[PDB]
């Protein structure tokens, strides 16, 4: 079942409230996972971590293991969940 694996959505639990949402696309090991987001939609930078402080949410997208940005974008689009994933919070600049 989707948990620390593809399809399961995760979010920055602590750091800047909740201004970053990501999904796991590639699993290296139990700790080493690659998280990413919709490139053209939200602009989520992909990063490979050993799970430092990242906790999954309740929401899940409909994809398989071994997907791409293309895959996620289209499947997210169909599920109408694109806007929720595009939703940006705490995107405030330090100086303005």
Swiss-Prot record:
GO terms for cellular component: cytosolic large ribosomal subunit. GO terms for biological process: ribosomal large subunit biogenesis; translation. One of its GO terms (molecular function) is structural constituent of ribosome. It comes from the Archaea. Keywords: Ribonucleoprotein, Ribosomal protein. Belongs to the eukaryotic ribosomal protein eL14 family. This is Large ribosomal subunit protein eL14. It comes from Saccharolobus solfataricus (strain ATCC 35092 / DSM 1617 / JCM 11322 / P2). The lineage of its organism: Archaea, Thermoproteota, Thermoprotei, Sulfolobales, Sulfolobaceae.
